[PDB]
Each structure stands twice: as structure tokens, then as C-alpha cells.
């Protein structure tokens, strides 16, 4: 079965370098020309780059020529892209393609890879910030009452919230973060439960954060109004 | 750092890689438009001297146009195939002799010299226009009675401008109307790489091929087509490269025979396919008659009519030749002569009975002399080897070269029932033939 | 109304009818003579740029008279046979060195252009002249001497009428003295079809060999032969056209094999007598080189030099290749490869092992898949027939085809005791060879 698999995306401030690979096996690799395809969040795709089979030729975008290098290493099965002077936007999914044609009008991508994320980004990773967000008389009664946790100002997307240690699973409902100006992010998340049943059961809201290791946990109860 | 040499002892063989293919898959065709005149012998007279040089050219012109008029009237390289070379140029013209496709090309080069025409059948041809001796001769040959010429350079001006339609009619016509090498009296460099740039393909090829034009012209045709009304028009079919960039090798093989001092009693051996191998979308493509792939540098121009699809398990008789995967092909005899092989970077040499071999380079003289057997020579401090009454030179062209030391297979067999002749034979038949030869040797 | 094709899978090889013969059985001599002027150096020792270049002129002009000078001083193909293609001309050349020969020539020409003398063999040839420069010499350009030259006319003048002899005489040079394709600096167009109209043969065969001069150049020959005096004579040797109109019929073939999913196991069949037939006097003329033959619309032009004559009953192996009356001869092998042969009128594919065959026309792509075995397909609604890695243009003639079925002939035979490495065998020779197999295979 033929497979591409891309490594080596993360998170990186303007103006530096990465360096992408794609490993490709099921196929014999020397016998094919080989792309680079991009996809910014929300966006159309863009073709990068491409090389030839031995490396005799070699083609690049408009947008990124004279800062990204295309190779390949035909003894191991990865070619790989170099990427200089990063800007805002390079920030995007970079997939590998195997080149398929008719040998004189049609070109096309038939094998796609997964994709590795890119993000090129001014910000400095911050801890997150958890707030509770106890449950209210306008926001009670009627059949149920709802609480919840705040994550505020975190670089890192990553973050991950559970309730009971995972022992809470219905009637969680998780909110997309918000990007703001300051490149920071915030989400909240909201629980449902019974109005009779407050005080009765525990919540506590964890806020488990990998890339400062902030894994905090904050008790959301009613406190007067 | 481009291209290396190895030698394997035990079959006598070497292999050379390095090199980049670029494999004909397909053909394009164009036509080419002549404006021609239909000048009457309505001439007034005249006696000058300027004058009868002007009819002298208009009558080689008339000659040549009617001339063109009569013209168009109503081992391992026996299992390759039979194809036919110029089927889609000629399909071309015979679309072209259809009613209004003459009119149709016409109108649509009037105001320009390149144009696209969609044809009857749907196909869309690229015409283009290359010389205009209608206009000249109109405007310039007939000023209204052309009985008495003021000038000498008008006649050298007539001259020249004739000269390209003579050397056309004269190739088509001691060619039966068809020139395998395109010259540049049928297209000019200009118009190849005009012709190259206008076709819907991508930039590496177009790369390969502007890079390559004496090539591109060397595996191109060209097949007169159609003359009438006002209009000379032949066809000119172009090689497309398909593959390109992928890795290619050479095999190079030489007898390995036996060294008994009795003048019989020796059993020969070898390897039958040579040629060139290179890779094609998971498989080779094999073309045993080496002599029709032309060789660039470091860049091989193979025509795949002339070849046979093999799996990459074939790559493996170079690195074991009693592999199960695949059965290699071999050939068996009893006549042992001593001969030579140049290879990519040194040479193989076969020397058997009493003929002497040596090598030898300008400055040192002689500095090697081979004894019985199969050997291989680098060219590196080598510049000929000879061979009984033979000298041969060396390629000195930069690389390098491996000996892989090992054991002559031809040792490992039985001389008794050995089988002595086998043109078309592989490992696996002589096995066989040797299995069946040994099991009715049996007593009582 | 002309051409149609049959396939026959019983044996996997199709015959196409139709064609129309024009076999060379002969050669007609003729002798072509230039007349020279004795121009010796002369003082004039100007400085005018015409003289100059009048000068260079008369140079070119020795330096070509001395060069002529110099120029003369003191399958189934390996069973034709070996013949001397220009024996006539140079056996009339030995001849026009004798005494008199070129005397008697020279004085009967001087009227007329045209000649019939009787050499002192007593054969009497057509003797031509072609180009008269001594005239243009002795008179008009050194008039009773031309030292100041006051036209420029007469330098353009004198370069076109020296073109010829220069153009000539690079030919010779190139090919040391022997040109096989006669140009038309050799013969004119107009000095051909004069000659032609001389030859003592019926009207039939002046129609057909004046509408294909073309061929008729391709199929002659020039031969440098003599200088001495003022004339210089070369002989050109033509082709006769002895048998034409009767009919012609080209057969194709391709292997034929079993289809065992084992990779071995399998054996394989081939029919070795391809290429032109034509039935001239009683018996069929073959030429196994079917390269041998030019092909104008369906008139074929074969040369009798390269062919075997054989019975009539040869063509029974189209219809029946078991028959008594003659014995088939076919070719026996283990190696089975796919393939294709491309035919008049569409196209054989031999399809084996994991190999994905197809046809495919522009407006629809793939029409048909092909499965193990040898098959047949129509250039009706077929453009392209792609086996492996290959791509094949049919031929886009026009005419019927006819498919017969029958079975394989190689399903009759048993594989353990079927010959292989049988090169040049038969249908009967087979047989022998497994009859005495199976009849030693009887031991108790």
C-alpha cells in the first residue's frame, strides 16, 4: 500500500528556519517526481515545489522563491523542504505529493500525505490562566443549571479540560478557542447540570497545558451573586 | 561523481551507472505551410542580360514546383516486435486531403505565422508559416511588364530567396518524400524552439529539449504532405519524452571459457543480455540493440520501440546469478577466441589459447600483460590494450571503478554433459538439461 | 476495393492482399558524357575585382578537373545467396577504356544530344550529353580574351553554369566514386523521363516507370567511370521492370505460447516465414526482408536479387499448416514475452505473463483489455494499441478485415517431450523429433 508520511512541523517566531520531511514507502521512489503542497487555516491549496526524479530539475512558487530549498535523498525515500526568513504567512499544512501524467497535456497529484501544521508566530508561549464560572440564578432553573471553567491568554492551541478525571462525560460541551490581537488565546468550557443537584456534586475543571506543563485545577461552586 | 564502473569476476561482465534517461513515449506533428505562386508564362520577351538571369530563376522555380507536383501520387533483438514509425504523420495528411482543410489552414494564417486549426476529425494542429515567395514575386517580380530589370541586386535578392524551396524539393525528391534527420532547411533552429515552446507540456521538458535540439532533430521525420492550390505543406512529427530524470545502467558481457592446454576439451559461457536498462513506473525497460540509444554526456535518448518491459527483479542476475527470483539468460559453445570489450571507464579482456594480451599507456609502454582467463583494466593509468593483432583505445572519461573478486561459474560444471550448444538457453534450462543428461546414466 | 486482411488464430498470424508487382529482373546501361575545355593558365595580370573573382571561377573549375582526375588510377534471410549488384556498369565501363571508344562518342554527338552507338562489342548503348562547358569557355568568356571584364553579369553567369560539374564531383568524392541513389545533379527530372522514353520496352511499362521516378532513382545506380581528352563520362545503371501487375501478399507472424501460471512450463511457437509474396511465372517469388521492398499506394517494388523462388503450394500454409503438400516452417522456443505486431490494417497482440495490454482510440480512450494469448484488433475504431511500456500507432489504411477462429496449434503438442532450442526446424522435423522420443520411451 503506497504511504506518505509527514514530520518535523512546530511552532515558529518570524524570520526563523524549519525543516519539514515527508518518508515515503510501497513504491520505488527514484522513478518519481515528487511536490510540496500548502494549505493555509480557512484557505485554498497552493502548490510550493517540486523535484525530479534526480534531482536534474527543480521549480518553485513566486511567494517563496529565493528562501525555501527542495531535496530529496533517494537511498533513504524522504526529500524534504528547508524553510528560511518564515513569515506570518507561512502559516499552514504542508503535504508531499507523487507527481502521476499522460506524458503530454494532463498532470495531476493522485497520492496525498497526511499533513504536518506549520505556525509561524511573534507570540512567547505564556501558562494558561483558569478562572471558575459558577453557576447564577439567570443562568439556573428551567431544567437544568450550567458551570463552567475559563482558560485565558495561552499561546500553545494544545490545551486539553476534564471535569471528574474523565469520569464526567455527558452534558460537557467544550467552545473553540478565540485568537485575539495580542496572539493569545482564551476558550471556555460549560457543563450541564441538574439545579437540584448543585452543591450535591463535585466540579473541578483541569487544565492540562504540555508545552508549560500547567496542569491546574480550579472547583467551580455557587458563591451568593 | 556522476557515473561508476564495476566488474563482477565470477560471470566476466560489468555494469555502469550514473546516467539520466530521457525515453521516447510518443510523437507530435505540425504542419508546415509554403505560400507558393501561380506565375503564367505570360512574359513579353526580351534580349538583355539581366533579363534572361530573371527567367533562368523563374524557371527553376516553375521546375521545382512541378517537380513537387509529380512527387505526391495515389543478441536478443528477435523478440523485440514490429511497429510502424511514421503512421501518425501519415494519418495526419490524410486528413488533410479532405475538402476544406487546405481553405481552413489558409484563412487562419493570413494575418500571422503560428496559428492553432482544429481540423475535421477534432485533432488541433499547430501550422505555422515559414517562407512567403507569393508576396516577393507579386510585388516585386511584376511591376505593371518586368520586360527590362534596372538593377543587378533584385536578380541576387531572387536568388537567394529561391534557394530554400530548390534544397527542399531536392531532399524530398532523392527521398521518396520522406527524411528520417530533419535539416535546417525544413525548420531553422529559431523555428524548432518556437515549435518547442508553443507545445502544451511542462517546463522540464522543454528544459530537456531546447538543451538537446541536435538530438530532438536526429529522431524526428518529415513526410511531404500536400501541394495545391497556393499553398506547399508537409508534416513534421517531433519525439515526446515522457520519462525523464530516472536512473539508467549499461551491461557490458565477455565468453568465459575454460583454460585446458589441449587444443578441445573446453566448454565456453556467456552472458546474452546486454544492452541498456532503465527505470520505468515500477518496472525497466530493456533495449538489447544498444546501438540505437544515443548517449549525451551524462543523458541517455532511448526509443521504447525498441524494447521489452522486465521487472526490477532482473537487477538481481548482477548480483547473483543462481537467485530463484529470476532465471538469467545465458549461451553455451566450444569455440574459444580471444577478444575485447571497452567498457564506460576500462576494458574486459577475454585471452585464451596462445595469443598474447597487454596494456599499455604513451609515457611507460607496456605495463601489464594477462595471462588465461577473463580480466578487467581501469583506465586510469591505461590508454590501449591489445589483444592478438588488435589495438584498442580506451574511453578517458572520468569516474570510478570496482573489481568484485570470484569464482568463474563455468568451473562449477561437469565437462561430460555439459550441454556444448545453447544460443537461446537460460541458468535454469541448463540445469535441467544437465539433470535429465545425468539421470539415464544408470547400470543394469 | 484494394487491400483486406485475414487473422487466423490457429496459428496466430494474419496475410494482407490487394498489392500489385513491380519485380526488378534486369539493368539498362546508359553512358552520360560532359564536355571539357583545355583551359591552360593564362598571364592577365590585372587587378580588377571582376577579373578576380573570374579567376577564383577558373580555379574551382581545374581543381574539380584535376580531383575527377585523381579520382580514377591504376528471419530465413541467411539462404539467398550473395550476388554483385554493378557488375553491368562496370563490365561497359572496361569496355569504353579500349582504343576508340571514346573517340567514336565524341563524333557522334557533336550534332545532336542524343545517340545510339554501337560500342566494339557490339552492343549499342544510349550515349547523352548533359552539360557543354567547353563552349562557354572557348567562346564568351575568352572570346578570338576577355582580360578586363566590363559586366558583372558574366561572373553571375559563369558561377551558374559551373555548379553542376562542382556538385558532381563532390558526390563522386564522397563516395568513392559510386552514388547508389542518383541525384538530381546526376540526372535531371526532364533528362530521366527522356531516357526512359528511349528504353526499347512496351508502353505498360513506361506509364509505370514514368509515375514513380521517384523509386526508379532509389533503385539505380552512378558509376565515375572515365576522363580522357575533353569528355568526361560516367555511366548511369537503371532498373528493368520485367514482371509487373501480378498480384502480391504480405504475411505477418508472432509467437505463439501457452498460458501456464507457473513462470516456467510454457512453450512457444513461430511461424519464421514472414515478408513479401508475388506470384510472377508459374511459381511465387519471397523475399524474407521485407525491408527489401518500396511500397507506392498498392504497388510494391521488390528486387529479385533477394528473393527464393518456391512453389506455388507454399500458400497452403495460410489455410491448412497441417497439410501433406507442404511442409510449414515455424521456430520453437521456452521464452514467452509480450509483444505486438502492427499490420496493414490494424494490429496482433501477443499479451503474456503479468503484462496490462490495451487499445484506445482519441475520443473514447480505452476500448478494449486484452487477456492471455494472442489476439487481433481492427484499425477501424482503433488508434493506438499499448503493450507494457510501449505505444503503438495502427495504420490508418483503408479496407476490410476478417477474423477467423480456430484453436491453437500449440495446445495439440505434449510439453514433456516438446523440442525448445529449434531454430530453423518445421512442422515435420517437429514431428520426427517427438515421434522417436515417445517411441524410446517404451523400456520394460
Known amino acids: 500500500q503506497v504511504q506518505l508520511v509527514e514530520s518535523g512541523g512546530g511552532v515558529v517566531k518570524p524570520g526563523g528556519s524549519l525543516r519539514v520531511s515527508c518518508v515515503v514507502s510501497?513504491?520505488?521512489?527514484?522513478?518519481?517526481?515528487m511536490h510540496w503542497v500548502r494549505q493555509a487555516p480557512g484557505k485554498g491549496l497552493e502548490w510550493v515545489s517540486s523535484?525530479?526524479?534526480?534531482?536534474?530539475?527543480?521549480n518553485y512558487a513566486e511567494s517563496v522563491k529565493g528562501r525555501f530549498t527542495i531535496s530529496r535523498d533517494n537511498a533513504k525515500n524522504s526529500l524534504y523542504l528547508q524553510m528560511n526568513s518564515l513569515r506570518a504567512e507561512d502559516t499552514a499544512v504542508y503535504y508531499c505529493?507523487?507527481?502521476?501524467?499522460?506524458?503530454?497535456?494532463?498532470?495531476?497529484?493522485?497520492?496525498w500525505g497526511q499533513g504536518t501544521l506549520v505556525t509561524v508566530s511573534s507570540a512567547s508561549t505564556k501558562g494558561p490562566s483558569v478562572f471558575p464560572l459558577a453557576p447564577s440564578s439567570k443562568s439556573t432553573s428551567g431544567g437544568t443549571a450550567a458551570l463552567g471553567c475559563l482558560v485565558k491568554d495561552y499561546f500553545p492551541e494544545p490545551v486539553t479540560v476534564s471535569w471528574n478525571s474523565g469520569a464526567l462525560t455527558s452534558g460537557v460541551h467544550t467552545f473553540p478557542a478565540v485568537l485575539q490581537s495580542s496572539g493569545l488565546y482564551s476558550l471556555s468550557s460549560v457543563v450541564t447540570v441538574p439545579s437540584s443537584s448543585l452543591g450535591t456534586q463535585t466540579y473541578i475543571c483541569n487544565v492540562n497545558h504540555k508545552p508549560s506543563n500547567t496542569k491546574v485545577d480550579k472547583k467551580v461552586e455557587p458563591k451568593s451573586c | 561523481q556522476n557515473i561508476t564502473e564495476e566488474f563482477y569476476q565470477s560471470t566476466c561482465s560489468a555494469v555502469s551507472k550514473g546516467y539520466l534517461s530521457a525515453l521516447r513515449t510518443g510523437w507530435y506533428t505540425s504542419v508546415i505551410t509554403i505560400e507558393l505562386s501561380n506565375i503564367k508564362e505570360n512574359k513579353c520577351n526580351g534580349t538583355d542580360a539581366k533579363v534572361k538571369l530573371i527567367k533562368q530563376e523563374l524557371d527553376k522555380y516553375k521546375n521545382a514546383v512541378t517537380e513537387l507536383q509529380l512527387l505526391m501520387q495515389s543478441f536478443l533483438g528477435f523478440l523485440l516486435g514490429v511497429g510502424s514509425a511514421i503512421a501518425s504523420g501519415v494519418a495526419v495528411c490524410k486528413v488533410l486531403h479532405l475538402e476544406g482543410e487546405v481553405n481552413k489552414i489558409k484563412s487562419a494564417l493570413l494575418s500571422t505565422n503560428k496559428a492553432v486549426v482544429s481540423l475535421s476529425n477534432g485533432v488541433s494542429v499547430l501550422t505555422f508559416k515559414v517562407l512567403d515567395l507569393k508576396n516577393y514575386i507579386d510585388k516585386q517580380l511584376l511591376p505593371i511588364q518586368s520586360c527590362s530589370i534596372s538593377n543587378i541586386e533584385t536578380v541576387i535578392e531572387f536568388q537567394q530567396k529561391n534557394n530554400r524551396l530548390l534544397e527542399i524539393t531536392r531532399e524530398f525528391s532523392v527521398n521518396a518524400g520522406v527524411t528520417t534527420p530533419v535539416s535546417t532547411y525544413m525548420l531553422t533552429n529559431s523555428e524548432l524552439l518556437s515549435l518547442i515552446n508553443d507545445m502544451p507540456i511542462t517546463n522540464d521538458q522543454k528544459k530537456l529539449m531546447s538543451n538537446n535540439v541536435q538530438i530532438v532533430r536526429q529522431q524526428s521525420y518529415s513526410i511531404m504532405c500536400i501541394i495545391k492550390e497556393e499553398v506547399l505543406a508537409y508534416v513534421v512529427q517531433l519525439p515526446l519524452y515522457g520519462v525523464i530524470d530516472t536512473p539508467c545502467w549499461k551491461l557490458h558481457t565477455s565468453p568465459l571459457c575454460t583454460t585446458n592446454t589441449k587444443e578441445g576439451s573446453n566448454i565456453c559461457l556467456t552472458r546474452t543480455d546486454r544492452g541498456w536498462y532503465c527505470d520505468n513506473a515500477g518496472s525497466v525497460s530493456f533495449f538489447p540493440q544498444a546501438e540505437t540509444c544515443k548517449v549525451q554526456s551524462n543523458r541517455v535518448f532511448c526509443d521504447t520501440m525498441n524494447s521489452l518491459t522486465l521487472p526490477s527483479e532482473v537487477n538481481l542476475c548482477n548480483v547473483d546469478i543462481f537467485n530463484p527470483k529470476y532465471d538469467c539468460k545465458i549461451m553455451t559453445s566450444k569455440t574459444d577466441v580471444s577478444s575485447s570489450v571497452i567498457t564506460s571507464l576500462g576494458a574486459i579482456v577475454s585471452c585464451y589459447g596462445k595469443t598474447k594480451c597487454t596494456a599499455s599507456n604513451k609515457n611507460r609502454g607496456i605495463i601489464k600483460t594477462f595471462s588465461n582467463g577473463c580480466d578487467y583494466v581501469s583506465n586510469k593509468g591505461v590508454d590501449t590494450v591489445s589483444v592478438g593483432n588488435t589495438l584498442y583505445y580506451v574511453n578517458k572519461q572520468e569516474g570510478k571503478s570496482l573489481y568484485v573478486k570470484g569464482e568463474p561459474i563455468i568451473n562449477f560444471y561437469d565437462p561430460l554433459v555439459f550441454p556444448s550448444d545453447e544460443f537461446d538457453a537460460s541458468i535454469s534450462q541448463v540445469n535441467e538439461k544437465i539433470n535429465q543428461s545425468l539421470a539415464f546414466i544408470r547400470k543394469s | 476495393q484494394n487491400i483486406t486482411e485475414e487473422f487466423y488464430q490457429s496459428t496466430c498470424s494474419a496475410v494482407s492482399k490487394g498489392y500489385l508487382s513491380a519485380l526488378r529482373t534486369g539493368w539498362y546501361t546508359s553512358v552520360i558524357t560532359i564536355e571539357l575545355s583545355n583551359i591552360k593558365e593564362n598571364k592577365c595580370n590585372g587587378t580588377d575585382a571582376k577579373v578576380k573573382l573570374i579567376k577564383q571561377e577558373l580555379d574551382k573549375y581545374k581543381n574539380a578537373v584535376t580531383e575527377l582526375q585523381l579520382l580514377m588510377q591504376s528471419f530465413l534471410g541467411f539462404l539467398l545467396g550473395v550476388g554483385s549488384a554493378i557488375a553491368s556498369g562496370v563490365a561497359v565501363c572496361k569496355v569504353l577504356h579500349l582504343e576508340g571508344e571514346v573517340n567514336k562518342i565524341k563524333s557522334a554527338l557533336l550534332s545532336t544530344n542524343k545517340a545510339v552507338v554501337s560500342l566494339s562489342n557490339g552492343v549499342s548503348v544510349l550515349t547523352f550529353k548533359v552539360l557543354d562547358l567547353k563552349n562557354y569557355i572557348d567562346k564568351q568568356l575568352l572570346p578570338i580574351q576577355s582580360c578586363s571584364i566590363s559586366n558583372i553579369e558574366t561572373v553571375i553567369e559563369f558561377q551558374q553554369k559551373n555548379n553542376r560539374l562542382l556538385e558532381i564531383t563532390r558526390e563522386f568524392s564522397v563516395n568513392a566514386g559510386v552514388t547508389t541513389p542518383v541525384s538530381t545533379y546526376m540526372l535531371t527530372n526532364s533528362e530521366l523521363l527522356s531516357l526512359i522514353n528511349d528504353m526499347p520496352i512496351t508502353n505498360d511499362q513506361k506509364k509505370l516507370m514514368s509515375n514513380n521516378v521517384q523509386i526508379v532513382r532509389q533503385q539505380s545506380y552512378s558509376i565515375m567511370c572515365i576522363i580522357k581528352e575533353e569528355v568526361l563520362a560516367y555511366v548511369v545503371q537503371l532498373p528493368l521492370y520485367g514482371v509487373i501487375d501480378t498480384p502480391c501478399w504480405k504475411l505477418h507472424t508472432s509467437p505463439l505460447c501457452t498460458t501456464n501460471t507457473k513462470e516456467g512450463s510454457n512453450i512457444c511457437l513461430t511461424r519464421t516465414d514472414r515478408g513479401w509474396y508475388c506470384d510472377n511465372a508459374g511459381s511465387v517469388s519471397f523475399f524474407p526482408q521485407a525491408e527489401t521492398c518500396k511500397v507506392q499506394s498498392n504497388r510494391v517494388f521488390c528486387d529479385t536479387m533477394n528473393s527464393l523462388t518456391l512453389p506455388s503450394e507454399v500458400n497452403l500454409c495460410n489455410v491448412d499448416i497441417f497439410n501433406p503438400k507442404y511442409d510449414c516452417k515455424i521456430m520453437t522456443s521456452k521464452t514467452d514475452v509480450s509483444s505486438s505486431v502492427i499490420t496493414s490494417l490494424g494490429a496482433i497482440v501477443s499479451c503474456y505473463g503479468k503484462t496490462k495490454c490495451t487499445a484506445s482510440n482519441k475520443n473514447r480512450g480505452i476500448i478494449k483489455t486484452f487477456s492471455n494469448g494472442c489476439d487481433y484488433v481492427s484499425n477501424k475504431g482503433v488508434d493506438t494499441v499499448s503493450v507494457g511500456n510501449t505505444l503503438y500507432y495502427v495504420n490508418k489504411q483503408e479496407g476490410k478485415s476478417l477474423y477467423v477462429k480456430g484453436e491453437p496449434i500449440i495446445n495439440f503438442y505434449d510439453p514433456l517431450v516438446f523440442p525448445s532450442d529449434e531454430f530453423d526446424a518445421s512442422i515435420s522435423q517437429v514431428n520426427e523429433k517427438i515421434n522417436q522420443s515417445l517411441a524410446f520411451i517404451r523400456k520394460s
Open positions: 523535484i525530479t526524479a534526480s534531482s536534474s530539475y527543480i
Open positions: 505529493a507523487r507527481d502521476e501524467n499522460t506524458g503530454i497535456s494532463h498532470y495531476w497529484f493522485d497520492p
Open positions: 510501497g513504491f520505488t521512489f527514484s522513478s518519481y517526481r
